[PDB]
Amino acid sequence: NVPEGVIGAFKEGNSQELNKYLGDKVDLIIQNKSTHADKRTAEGTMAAFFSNHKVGSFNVNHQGKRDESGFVIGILMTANGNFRVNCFFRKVQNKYVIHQIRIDKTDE
Ligand SMILES: [Cl-]
Ligand SMILES: [Cl-]
Ligand SMILES: [Cl-]
Ligand SMILES: [Cl-]
């Protein structure tokens, strides 16, 4: 169910759903703050992000995958800013999991 499940999790601002797709180690870069997080910390960071930025919409404009990696790029509109989101996936145990999330506020 990748990347549909991740896209849905962002659309709903739901870190618990996102969790299901997180790798055991995730690099987060959120407003230029970088963290190399275990899964539990990554979910916690995303929970805080969604709590502080109530999601209105998430729309993807480019996605793709090869045998061992993939990506999703889109725009997240929230009640506290709009953000470009990049999710980069790696294949682990035959499943695509998130290895990096970048979130960067738009210039508006
Ligand atoms: Cl950590
Ligand atoms: Cl935050
Ligand atoms: Cl979409
Ligand atoms: Cl959409």
Side-chain angles (χ1 to χ4, degrees), residues 1-65 67-93 95-108:
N1 195 27
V2 175
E4 298 73 27
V6 169
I7 293 169
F10 272 90
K11 283 178 174 287
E12 305 166 35
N14 196 327
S15 63
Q16 195 171 324
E17 299 284 10
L18 182 64
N19 187 64
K20 283 180 55 181
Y21 316 100
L22 294 175
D24 289 332
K25 296 289 186 182
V26 183
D27 294 313
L28 303 171
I29 309 93
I30 303 181
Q31 285 314 97
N32 285 333
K33 296 290 187 172
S34 185
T35 61
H36 181 64
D38 63 16
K39 198 179 155 180
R40 171 164 226 174
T41 301
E43 188 285 331
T45 298
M46 289 307 307
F49 182 84
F50 290 142
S51 290
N52 285 314
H53 308 85
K54 184 189 174 184
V55 175
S57 67
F58 182 57
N59 291 278
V60 176
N61 296 298
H62 197 9
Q63 55 187 303
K65 59 174 165 62
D67 268 21
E68 303 308 313
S69 59
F71 67 92
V72 171
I73 303 169
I75 301 284
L76 188 72
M77 292 181 56
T78 88
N80 186 21
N82 303 321
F83 301 86
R84 310 268 255 113
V85 178
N86 310 156
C87 302
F88 302 117
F89 297 78
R90 62 189 204 271
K91 183 172 278 172
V92 176
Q93 301 304 137
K95 305 181 196 68
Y96 291 96
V97 297
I98 298 166
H99 174 61
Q100 181 172 126
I101 304 178
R102 182 182 158 262
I103 299 178
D104 199 72
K105 192 177 177 301
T106 64
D107 189 24
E108 62 195 325

